[PDB]
Structure formats: C-alpha cells, structure tokens
Amino acid sequence: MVDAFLGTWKLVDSKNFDDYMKSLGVGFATRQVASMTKPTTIIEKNGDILTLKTHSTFKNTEISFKLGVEFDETTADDRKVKSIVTLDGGKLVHLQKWDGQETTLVRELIDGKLILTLTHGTAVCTRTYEKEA
C-alpha cells in the first residue's frame, strides 16, 4: 500500500514554507536558514514499520511508526507532539497534535513527484520532491 512512496527524495520546489513556519512560531533566523535548505527525505519499510528520515545541512530528523498507530514525536522545530500516519485516498497523511493544536503533513504522488502539503492554522505550504535513483 505505501510502496510508491518508498525511496530517497530531494526537494525541488517550495511554496509558502515561511508562512507555515511562522504559523508554528518558528523564529526569523531559523526560518531564514530553513528557506534555503533542500532536504533529502528517505522513506523505508521493514514489515509494518516505516522509517522516515529528513536530512539537511541545518537540521535532521528521523521517525519510525506503524500506519494507524499513534507515536510520540519531537519535530524539527522541537514541538513534542502526538502523531499518527495513515493512508487516505492513496495519500500518506501525517497528523500531529499538541497543546490542542494540529498540523497535517500530506504526501501524494503526482506524475512520479512527491507533493508534501503542510497545513497549520490557515497556512498551506506545498513542497515538491523528486526521486533519486
């Protein structure tokens, strides 16, 4: 079910990431560095366990989870959240909850590119990743 998402992906387009970060309360200096970073995202599976790595010159993260099972997560911007990842309409949907807030990180494949849509508050960021061979 998740298999077309698996692999190594490189950021190739970003829209409204500053809006998203600002909505989350990220400080200017961090936003500034983040806006010039091009992360690599690695998604791998081992049975029912998915591992999602995000690597850059600034911050790195790694999470492991089972689809449909809540997990604790500490995000790149240091939020301690309750998370769940599920497939919905063929999209990989990641929901984070903390302090009564929510944000969604939705991944979908369009023409072989991975489109990540980040929503918090009214801010909607779209980032596009291409597969590395």
Work out whether 30 is an interface residue with ligand ACD (CB under 6 A): yes
Among the listed ranges 2-10, 63-71, 73-81, 86-94, the one in contact with ligand ACD (CB under 6 A) is 73-81
3-state secondary structure the chain: CCHHHCEEEEEEEEECHHHHHHHCCCCHHHHHHHCCCCCEEEEEEECCEEEEEEECCCCCEEEEEECCCCEEEECCCCCEEEEEEEEECCEEEEEEEECCEEEEEEEEEECCEEEEEEEECCEEEEEEEEEEC
Work out whether 77 is an interface residue with ligand ACD (CB under 6 A): yes
Least Å distance, CB 1 to ligand ACD, is 21
Work out whether 16 is an interface residue with ligand ACD (CB under 6 A): no
Residue of 8, 18, 19, 54 that binds ligand ACD (CB under 6 A): 54
- Which residues define the annotated binding site? 127-129
Residues at the interface with ligand ACD (CB under 6 A): 11, 21, 24, 26, 30, 34, 37, 39, 41, 54, 56, 58-61, 75-77, 116, 127
